[PDB]
Design a protein around this ligand. Structure first.
Ligand SMILES: Nc1ncnc2c1ncn2[C@@H]1O[C@H](COP(=O)(O)OP(=O)(O)OP(=O)(O)O)[C@@H](O)[C@H]1O
Ligand SMILES: Nc1ncnc2c1ncn2[C@@H]1O[C@H](COP(=O)(O)OP(=O)(O)O)[C@@H](O)[C@H]1O
Ligand SMILES: Nc1ncnc2c1ncn2[C@@H]1O[C@H](COP(=O)(O)OP(=O)(O)O)[C@@H](O)[C@H]1O
Ligand SMILES: *N(C(=O)NC1CCCCC1)C1CCCCC1
Ligand SMILES: [Mg+2]
Ligand SMILES: [Mg+2]
Ligand SMILES: [Mg+2]
Lengths: 492, 467, 466
């Protein structure tokens, strides 16, 4: 008479070890369906075999024993989604962990949905200003783009993403709704205290109000760290599909791949290259394709992604790193040598790229940065070669002069992202040649003073450049008058 | 016959048949699904059970779910009705424009043309790209491969070639998007509507589109290439008229295969690949070819994992080509685009008897001054230049000039270079490189040769650089 | 109830229970043994059988031997009673001083503090060691890691730190020997009695000892760190104070785990390590931390296999540290101690808003000239210094003087160097490095800067050079 424990909707643990439960029964369970253990603990059905279901546990497995009851949920893994998550810190499953109570979300979304295909999209064209001169000019990002941040530990990777988040406050406090951009920071494999400092940094900057933080830290089970990235991405697709724009950071995917490898090997799937599952690429390609620009017929919203990869000994050319690069719409490569020489952000120009190009820049920024990337690449080449004392013609000497000055103008301190018209103004002074005779060690001081000057007394000029999104002949004529005169004074 | 799913692990699905057992390669339709889910039979495990690879996601599948044998391999629409349309791996339209009203269908698995069907004719196909036309010229109806690590220029080169060769082209084109960027597919598609290469209103479309990108599971990425070449084969055979076939990126076919190899029960070969890499590749590649019935000019982008051309995937690919264009990160990093490696690109037609000894000698001269500089580089980086003779250092300076004259502003690349695209005639290429080799420009500065078209612009840039 | 041994392979033992299966992590007691032999449940294999890890030798075990479920995970003594005492993995006294009579016991397993319990206060901890204070400062209640290849100086450094911080500390300390030398444990024990931090006659002891050295079987070494940190957790909360936790060497935790993994049935990961490497380390490290309830200042020595920092063990450890001190074999061979790589050592505290702009700028300055010198070294290797521009000769010179000024005689090494140890105040460290950078000593010979304390000693030495 008791038919609550049949073997179609329920099962029993055959064995349990290392976050893997082998379950007998669950005959009607679906591949990738969420299941629940007697303990309140959730798990996901990954292996559907003739005699057992292979289940991946989303928590501490110490709570499961041989014989426990396992119940179907009838639902493919999903998570809570919507605006109620802004300003909140949640785990990989969507549960609040900031101690501010339950998230009253009124909607949910599958973590594995496939990315939009060809039709629903439209060319990336709206600027996604990081507020970092070197990025916004050399390797510009547009809304719906994917741009990798890669480099050895401590080269400045997390910092680029934080400043980028803080930068949006200009638009999020603004009145133009189209310019708004909600942020998602996914923490994977990190140390909890590091994530807390981080959210304290965003709070102090007053950016937490428009950011969702998804945290699967170092002591969270492997499957939790594997899911985290897909969970936050769904939270991001909510904006993308409802006429809004969101920005996502996966910090980092190196650690997510290590967890995937753990879970996969424990499921007995035969290891592949470098011990990773033979499908590590698909792990990440799948996820990042979800960042996209939607067409007006589809709401015209978008999701922008900045994945992070940690290299070993500055080897961008390795397997894991080239995989991810082969997915994204560009990459920002940072090296420890440049970081220590004073080049910060420590970007290597020849090795970084943007696959969207000037189509992600305003006309103004294009007017000053258009040929600067190739030119800076050639500059670094000839600079290395000239160290051979060889006689230098006027042409190469001028290239060296120009390159060394621009190198200084792209230096930038932390926590103070610049408005686009301001970057345009300081780029201009260098690219137009006005600084070729200023001692290179003076370029940073010049920029700091020049900028406060134009901001203090030339709000109209700055405002016109920002409003027209370009440098008119008139705006051009006024800048020339400002830099030549200001410079002369500066060199007094 | 009706089957029942007995096992599901990722993209690999085991089905059991009580009566008829479907032969390897047959397409099975899964019952109970919102959208068409196809399974391809790969092996017969025994005990009336077959192993299959799914052509779309397997989430939602349950053990005991019914499966039907279609009684044949995946069959897709082929013919003039595919022009201007976008299909997926299984021949379904993905352009939201309705059914592909073709009069015929065709299996995506086919035997390769026999040895008696081969053609040996070979003629130059000028691209307008200085390094290619000069050093390793492409041939009409030949097999062309573009090798490159991640982000070195493969796609930008294929887009440029489509722009310079396929717009003029009077026949038909096929573009296969294989495990690449979906964004790139939406890009290309609107690009082609603008150029009228694709027409949504009348029936003047000259290109067929097939896509299976990196958002799809491995089964789909492992067969989409076949889908695309199947479309191309019809034009070649059932119409004869000249066909262009572009594939970005065929490596993805090999990677797809390796994603499921262990699940298919294979012992891994070197570097984690499937033991069948070579034969898998052969039976597919041997179909991409010109025959006596008709011509196919194939251009395939080829990914190089970890930037290592000795990687089994790229390494087994050199043998199926007539012209190789090898792209390098070391060169791209220097601002040199296209980042072609002049000392690692080749062509079966680079022969004095085919291109003329003037073309041959200049190309050969360029290669020699460059290999010589390259062999020199590390030495002078230590002992300095002063120890070289006036002639030894005159080659150092011309070598650097020649390396710069190989760069070129692509039309398609305007959004990256900030320069107006350029197209250089073959004769102008030979002339220009010849003159530098002869010394007729030893007085111009290096940068004059950087990012320009014809040699006149080098002279003019030098003037623009003077004052 | 009781279970029986069905299988034995090294530290791995399988036990069948006809009634009531013991949960994962529970401690089982093997019967018929002269000394306590604990088995820790690792997994439920099925068919009423469990796979476990022994905490001591398995020689003498027989198929059929009885095993008892203790009803909980390994529990050890905690509180004021652990001070001055030495215990092993399972809480037993190993100093021959009798029973540890505590009122409290605690399981060596436990969930790591929650996100809401994390602390965000950042305050420097001045060590008196120039390289560290200047370039990658330690933080009160932060996590410090000391990386080093074989015999490069990890132990000497942790000992100097105990000598410079633990002694002048009001609170308690916990030292955990994990897979290292037993006689180093004997030296440490006698050294602390001599100095009075340990007292066998009164209740003034300030340090609690936990040891599971390289003479122990894998299971023990894989758990001693949990034991040590469990004692420190008590002092952290159950007293609300400041605790120091020293561990030599946490690498041995991962190595021991690698030994049993080879027997637990796992498919190997890169370089033969256990697939669970990162998560095993994660659930352990996340407990070694400061919370809003109390602070733990931890110092962990980290071994580097074959001197390869990309080895999975070390490479995975970086993510757990607030400050990293990377020792270098090439530096030590130059005679420069401590052998700290000034360009590969970092601190999350090196921020102008935390240490001040002067301190911040002097550090960036030192690292800048060191990196520029580094970029030159390649051209110097063949042709040498005589071929450099009169300008590069200058960066070389100041750089080499800076490399030596980072060196310093330790008090704890006096016994073999013959040089009085030195402790330089942070203000004195910034200044000295400023002066070298500004050129105020371009006229002083390099050797004057090697192995001294404050700047004044450099000049004095430059004088004794007559
Ligand atoms: N533009 C900058 N100027 C100065 N310091 C910077 C800049 N960007 C980052 N930093 C500093 O560099 C250090 C390392 O930065 P960050 O944590 O972002 O690097 P990472 O690549 O994420 O390292 P990790 O391995 O810790 O993840 C920090 O102290 C940070 O404040
Ligand atoms: N010919 C070129 N001129 C200028 N930039 C180029 C050129 N080719 C590639 N690039 C730059 O490098 C990026 C990567 O090139 P892409 O063709 O997308 O690489 P892949 O080989 O990975 O397909 C481009 O988006 C662009 O920024
Ligand atoms: N600060 C130091 N001053 C002088 N010699 C040192 C110092 N640190 C290490 N050494 C030398 O290196 C040896 C090994 O140091 P130790 O800490 O025991 O190595 P490990 O890194 O293996 O722990 C010491 O015996 C001594 O000879
Ligand atoms: N774009 C391209 O080929 N499409 C346009 C270019 C201008 C003329 C019409 C066609 C490329 C697509 C791939 C990335 C780079 C640009
Ligand atoms: Mg980081
Ligand atoms: Mg590409
Ligand atoms: Mg030691």
């Amino acid at each position: 008479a008791d038919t609550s424990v049949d073997l179609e909707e329920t099962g029993r643990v055959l064995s349990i070890g290392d976050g893997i439960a082998r379950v007998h029964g669950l005959r009607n369970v679906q591949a990738e369906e969420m299941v629940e253990f007697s303990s309140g603990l959730k798990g996901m059905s990954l292996n559907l075999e003739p005699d057992n279901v292979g289940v991946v546990v989303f928590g501490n497995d110490k709570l499961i024993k041989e014989g426990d009851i396992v119940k179907r949920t009838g639902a493919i893994v999903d998570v809570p989604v919507g605006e109620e998550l802004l300003g909140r810190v949640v785990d990989a499953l969507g549960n609040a962990i900031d101690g501010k109570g339950p998230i009253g979300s009124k909607a949910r979304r599958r973590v594995g949905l496939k990315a939009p295909g060809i039709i629903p999209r439209i060319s990336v064209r709206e600027p996604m200003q990081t507020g970092i001169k070197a990025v916004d000019s050399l390797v510009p990002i547009g809304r719906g783009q994917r741009e990798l941040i890669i480099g050895d530990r401590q080269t400045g990777k997390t910092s680029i993403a934080i400043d980028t988040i803080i930068n949006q406050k200009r638009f999020n406090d603004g009145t133009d709704e189209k310019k708004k951009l909600y942020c998602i920071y996914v923490a994977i494999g990190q140390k909890r205290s590091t994530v807390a400092q981080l959210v304290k940094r965003l709070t102090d900057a007053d950016a937490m109000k428009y950011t969702i933080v998804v945290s699967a830290t170092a002591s969270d089970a492997a499957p939790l760290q594997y899911l985290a990235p897909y969970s936050g991405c769904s939270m991001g697709e909510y904006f993308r599909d409802n006429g809004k724009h969101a920005l996502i950071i996966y910090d980092d995917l190196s650690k997510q791949a290590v967890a995937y490898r753990q879970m996969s090997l424990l499921l007995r799937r035969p290891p592949g290259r470098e011990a990773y599952p033979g499908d590590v690429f698909y792990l990440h390609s799948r996820l990042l394709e979800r960042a996209a620009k939607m067409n007006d017929a589809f709401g015209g919203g978008s999701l922008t992604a900045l994945p992070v990869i940690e290299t070993q000994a500055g080897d961008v050319s390795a397997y894991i790193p080239t995989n991810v690069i082969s997915i994204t719409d560009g990459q920002i490569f940072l090296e420890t040598e440049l970081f220590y020489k004073g080049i910060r952000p420590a970007i290597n120009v020849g090795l970084s790229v943007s696959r969207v190009g000037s189509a992600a820049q305003t006309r103004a920024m294009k007017q000053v940065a258009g040929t600067m990337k190739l030119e800076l690449a050639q500059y670094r080449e000839v600079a290395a070669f000239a160290q051979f004392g060889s006689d230098l013609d006027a042409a190469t000497q001028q290239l060296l002069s120009r390159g060394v000055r621009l190198t200084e103008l792209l230096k930038q301190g932390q926590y103070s992202p610049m408005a686009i018209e301001e970057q345009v103004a300081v780029i201009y002074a260098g690219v137009r040649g006005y600084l070729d005779k200023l001692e290179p060690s003076k370029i940073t001081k010049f920029e700091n003073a020049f900028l406060s000057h134009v901001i203090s007394q030339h709000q109209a000029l700055l405002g016109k450049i920002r409003t027209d999104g370009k440098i008119s002949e008139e705006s051009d004529a006024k800048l020339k008058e400002i830099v030549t005169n200001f410079l002369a004074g500066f060199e007094a | 016959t009706t089957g029942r799913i007995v096992a599901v692990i990722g993209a690999v699905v085991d089905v059991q048949f009580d009566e008829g057992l479907p032969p390897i390669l047959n397409a099975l339709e899964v019952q109970g699904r919102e959208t068409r889910l196809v399974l391809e039979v790969a092996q017969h495990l025994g005990e009336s059970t077959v192993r299959t690879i799914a052509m779309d996601g397997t989430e939602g599948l349950v053990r005991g779910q019914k499966v039907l044998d279609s009684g044949a391999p995946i069959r897709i629409p082929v013919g003039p009705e595919t022009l201007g349309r976008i299909m997926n791996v299984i021949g379904e339209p993905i352009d939201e424009r309705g059914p592909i009203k073709t009069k015929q269908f065709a299996a995506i698995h086919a035997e390769a043309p026999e040895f008696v069907e081969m053609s040996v004719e070979q003629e130059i196909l000028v691209t307008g790209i200085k390094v290619v036309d000069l050093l390793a010229p492409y041939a009409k109806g030949g097999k062309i491969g573009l090798f490159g690590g991640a982000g070195v220029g493969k796609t930008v080169l294929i887009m440029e070639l489509i722009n310079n060769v396929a717009k003029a082209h009077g026949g038909y084109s096929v573009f296969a998007g294989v495990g690449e960027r979906t964004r790139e597919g939406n890009d290309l598609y609107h690009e082609m509507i603008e150029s009228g290469v694709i027409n949504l209103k009348d029936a003047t479309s000259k290109v067929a589109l097939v896509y299976g990108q990196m958002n799809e599971p491995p089964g789909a990425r492992a067969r989409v290439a076949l889908t695309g070449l199947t479309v191309a084969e019809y034009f070649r055979d059932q119409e004869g008229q000249d066909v262009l076939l572009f594939i970005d990126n065929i490596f993805r076919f090999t990677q797809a295969g390796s994603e499921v190899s262990a699940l298919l029960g294979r012992i891994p070969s070197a570097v984690g690949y499937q033991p069948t890499l070579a034969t898998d590749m052969g039976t597919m590649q041997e179909r991409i070819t010109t025959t006596k019935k008709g011509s196919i000019t194939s251009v395939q982008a080829i990914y190089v994992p970890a930037d290592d051309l000795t990687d089994p995937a790229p390494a087994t690919t050199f043998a199926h080509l007539d012209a190789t264009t090898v792209l390098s990160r070391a060169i791209a990093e220097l601002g040199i685009y296209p980042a072609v490696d002049p000392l690692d690109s080749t062509s079966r037609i680079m022969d004095p008897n085919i291109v003329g000894s003037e073309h041959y000698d200049v190309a050969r001269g360029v290669q020699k001054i460059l290999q010589d500089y390259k062999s020199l580089q590390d030495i002078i980086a230590i002992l300095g230049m002063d120890e070289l003779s006036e002639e030894d250092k005159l080659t150092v300076s011309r070598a650097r000039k020649i390396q710069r004259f190989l760069s070129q502003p692509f039309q398609v690349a305007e959004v990256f270079t900030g320069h107006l695209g350029k197209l250089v005639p073959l004769k102008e290429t030979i002339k220009g490189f010849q003159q530098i080799l002869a010394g007729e420009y030893d007085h111009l500065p290096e940068q004059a040769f950087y990012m320009v078209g014809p040699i006149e612009e080098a002279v003019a840039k030098a003037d623009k650089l003077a004052e």
